[PDB]
Amino acid sequence: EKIEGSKSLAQSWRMKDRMKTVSVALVLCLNVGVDPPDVVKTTPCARL
Amino acid sequence: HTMVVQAITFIFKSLGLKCVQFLPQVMPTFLNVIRVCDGAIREFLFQQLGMLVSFVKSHIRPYMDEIVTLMREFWVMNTSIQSTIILLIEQIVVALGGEFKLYLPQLIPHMLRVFMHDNSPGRIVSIKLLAAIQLFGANLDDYLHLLLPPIVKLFDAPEAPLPSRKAALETVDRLTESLDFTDYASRIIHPIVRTLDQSPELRSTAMDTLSSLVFQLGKKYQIFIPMVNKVLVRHRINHQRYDVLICRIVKGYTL
Amino acid sequence: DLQTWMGSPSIFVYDCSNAGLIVKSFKQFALQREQELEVSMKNCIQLAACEATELLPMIPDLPADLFTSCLTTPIKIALRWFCMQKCVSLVPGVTLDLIEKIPGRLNDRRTPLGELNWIFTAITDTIAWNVLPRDLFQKLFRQDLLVASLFRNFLLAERIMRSYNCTPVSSPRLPPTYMHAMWQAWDLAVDICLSQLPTIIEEGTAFRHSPFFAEQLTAFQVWLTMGVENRNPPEQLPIVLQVLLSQVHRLRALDLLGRFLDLGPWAVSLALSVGIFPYVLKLLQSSARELRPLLVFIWAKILAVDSSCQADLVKDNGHKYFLSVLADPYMPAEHRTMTAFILAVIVNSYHTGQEACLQGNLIAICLEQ
């Protein structure tokens, strides 16, 4: 073999940046006790 | 018999989704009427039950088990009632949707008998049942290994007429869009390759089915490429999408 | 207007019936803003329970909040859905009531419930790595934890909702994973895990752990035997990562991972892309001397490729871990040679590392050997 160093490849594995989810928005349009007019729910329907 | 049920059908259509209220009254009687009806009315009732089911849609779940029992009992090799019931089958699938897979296993014995012994002129009752199978969708997951062999025999049988062969191939195209076909690649590809010899008329339809299957298999189709290429050259089969798809698979680009 | 008030870095979760319409209209208003920008699209992530045409399921067995539950309680619906499939016939005596009363927690991996969460995390992260392109994988499953968790659970939603004529929608479009083979492995893992529950609840039997992770390491070993050719990489590489987190199978995994790195420098590059580095670095805080020969081997192969990691090793004081190995007569001379190489890389043209190793008395230690 030749006395030469092996060329290092472009290691791109490193992460560019670290994101941080600082806050969370829970918008709940549950309308508990009321049924939306568009969908005629069945009598058992889904309650949970 | 004829006038009473024609009224109830128009009433439910005119009501909309508020007809659900009346379900507990109509259905138990209506089902018992189908049981004791005789001759022509049977067929007519099944026609009108289909309309009912199309309006009630998901709400028909409690009585669905009885309806299947009714169908199972009154399914006969009589061509007339078979075409009638197949239409009622197509309407149940759109009504229940995901919940249809609970009841399909009861119907399978009759569907497998339809393919085995179909005396319909040109097997148009089979062709109708193929069009129904297209609607089945992701319900067919747990039962595809059962239904598929009859369908495969249909498009490989040379005695069978060309229309009925086109219908089977187009069905596999649809089912490819929704179901997974990796397991059963060999069970289909070998009849297809054989079909590309015995008849040049199906060459177009069949090749379109192949491309769809190839798209679904992806890298798993690589195995068959040598063997199919041999059959394609022998009859100069030049499909645009297929040559692109093979080129894409061999290259490894994903799109 | 809704995307006016929210800023650039944001993520949107729509749990409604025609949710596809929102995703279409979101991209429209995104394009409309891009047209106005001449004279925030890739940043905005979107998850949708359904396609615009599709409707939400009305089935009393399932919860109304089917999509959110999937995203936020994957194990809970996964077991309830498992108990609704036809495959329950193969396990009689497993009702929903036993699922309610499953023992354990979601943290303790030695419990039955924590086992499933650990298995689920491995299987989902494995499916993603094998199916998605490398760029999009590190974008979603490596950038930030919370997104990675949502997409992990999104793959489960796709599987369950498919069985009810529902197609979930994502903003970075994913190829369909529902029919992947690994899902069958998930079934077996579930089967074995909650086949013991009758005995755990009623008999009070000690929950034996699943052979899943063991068998997956066995699969990785079998691949290495005839892995010389540059064929498709082994699917189980992300599973080996998940196994490193425990101690029960840590020795076996670290061994196989080293054997893998042996295959060539291409493999070490792969292992860096999947994200093995920050986990191997945490083991340098351990004091178990049995680990020392394995880490020396692994670190020599990695540092041979990417010499820039010498910066990271000085921050965490990992150079002390190896200094100890170089002053241990009982350590074989084969591993001591790699250790001297590792130090010769950390020191290479890096004034911060030379000042740090000088204080660690390297010259005196070297002369001893």
State how far the alpha carbon of B119 is from the alpha carbons of B42, B80, C147, C273, in Å. Answer: 22, 12, 58, 62
Query: What are phi and psi for residue B71, nearest 5 degrees?
Result: -55, -50
Q: Which residues of C297-335 are buried (b: 16+ CB within 10 A; e: fewer)?
A: bbbbbbbbbbbebbeebbeeebbebbbebbbeeebeeeb
- For residue A38, give the chain C residue with the closest CA: C17
Are C80 and C206 in contact, with CB atoms under 8 Å apart?
no
Give the contacts of C237 (CB within 8 A, at least 6 positions apart).
C129, C220, C260, C270, C271, C274
Contact B98 C86 (CB under 8 A): no
DSSP state, residue C203: I
Query: How far does the CA of residue C12 sit from the closest CA of chain A (Å)?
Result: 10
Min distance C29 CA to chain B CA atoms (Å):
25
Q: How far apart (Å, rounded) are the C-alpha atoms in residues C336 and C328?
A: 9
A45 conformational bin, left if phi > 0, alpha if psi -120 to 50, beta if neither? left
Q: Which of C99, C3, C92 is nearest to C44 (CA)?
A: C3
User: Chain B interface residues facing chain C, Cβ-Cβ under 8 Å?
Assistant: 58, 97-99, 137-138, 141-142, 180, 182, 254
Contacts of C314 (CB under 8 A, 6+ apart): C346, C350, C352, C353, C356
Subunits with 3+ Cβ pairs within 8 Å of B are A, C
In the numeric block, which tokens belong to residue A48?
């949970």
Set of chain B residues whose Cβ sits within 8 Å of the Cβ of C179: 180, 182
Query: Does C143 sit within 8 Å of A17, measured CB to CB?
Result: yes
3-state secondary structure chain B: CHHHHHHHHHHHHHHCCHHHHHHHHHHHHHHHHHHHCCCHHHHHHHHHHHHHHHHHHHHHHHHHHHHHHHHHHHCCCCHHHHHHHHHHHHHHHHHHHHHHHHCHHHHHHHHHHHHHCCCCHHHHHHHHHHHHHHHHHHHHHHHHHHHHHHHHHHHHCCCCCHHHHHHHHHHHHHHHHHCCCCCCHHHHHHHHHHHHHHCCCCHHHHHHHHHHHHHHHHHHHHHHHHHHHHHHHHCCCCCHHHHHHHHHHHHCCCC
List beta partners, residue C47. C13, C170
Partners of chain C (3+ Cβ pairs below 8 A) = A, B
- Cross-strand partners of C169: C48
- List C13's β-bridge partners, or say none: C47
- Judging contacts by C-beta atoms under 8 Å, the chain B residues touching residue A40 are 17-18, 20
Residues of A in Cβ contact (< 8 Å) with B18:
40
Helix axes B162-178, B124-136, angle to 10 degrees: 10
Residue C337 main-chain phi, psi, to 5 deg = -70, -45
- Phi then psi for C180, rounded to 5 degrees? -65, 150
Residue B9 near residue B49, CB atoms below 8 Å: no
Q: Give CA–CA dist C308/C303, Å, rounded.
A: 8
Token look-up 């790595």 returns C129
Q: How far apart are CA C359 and CA C327, in angstroms?
A: 15
- C87 DSSP 8-state letter: G
| Number of inter-chain CB pairs under 8 A, A vs B | 6
Q: Measured between CB atoms, does C367 come within 8 Å of chain B?
A: no
Q: Which residues of C touch B182 (CB under 8 A)?
A: 179
Q: Please name the chains neighbouring A, where neighbouring means 3+ C-beta pairs under 8 angstroms.
A: B, C
- Which of B58, B138, B254 is the closest to C163 by Cβ? B138
Q: What is the DSSP string of C264-306?
A: -HHHHHHHHHHT-HHHHHHGGG---GGGHHHHHHHHHHHHHH-
Residue A27 phi/psi, 5° resolution?
A: -90, 110
Rounded Cα–Cα distance for residues C187 and C81 (Å) = 11
Residue C22 dihedral angles phi and psi, to the nearest 5°: -65, -45
Per-residue DSSP letter, C148 = H
Radius of gyration of chain B (CA): 21
- Do C12 and C147 touch, CB atoms closer than 8 A? no
Other residues' Cβ atoms within 10 Å of the Cβ of residue B171 = 21
CB atoms within 10 A of CB B207: 20
CA distance A8 to chain B (A): 26
Cβ separation of B58 and A42 shorter than 8 Å? Answer: yes
In sign, the C-alpha dihedral spanning C102, C108, C109, C111 is: negative
C53 touches C20 (CB < 8 A): yes
CB within 8 Å: C64 and A44: no
Q: How many CB atoms lie within 10 A of CB A25?
A: 7
Q: Which residues make Cβ contacts (< 8 Å) with residue B236, sequence separation at least 6?
A: none
Q: How far apart are the first and last CA of chain A?
A: 71
* CA–CA separation, C14 and B253 (whole Å): 32
Q: How far apart are CA B131 and CA C7, in angstroms?
A: 49
Residues 47-86 of C with CB under 8 A from A: 55, 57-60, 62-66
Which residues touch B255 (CB under 8 Å, ≥6 apart)? Answer: B248
The resolution, in angstroms to one decimal, equals 4.2
Burial class of B102 by CB neighbour count within 10 A (0 to 12, 13 to 18, 19+)? middle
Interface A-C: count of C-beta contacts within 8 A: 55
Going by C-beta distance under 8 Å and a sequence separation of 6 or more, which residues neighbour residue C113? C75, C102, C103, C104, C105, C106
**Which residues of chain C are within 8 Å of residue A18 when distances are taken between CB atoms?**
143-144
Phi-psi region of A19 (alpha: psi -120 to 50; beta: other; left: phi over 0): beta
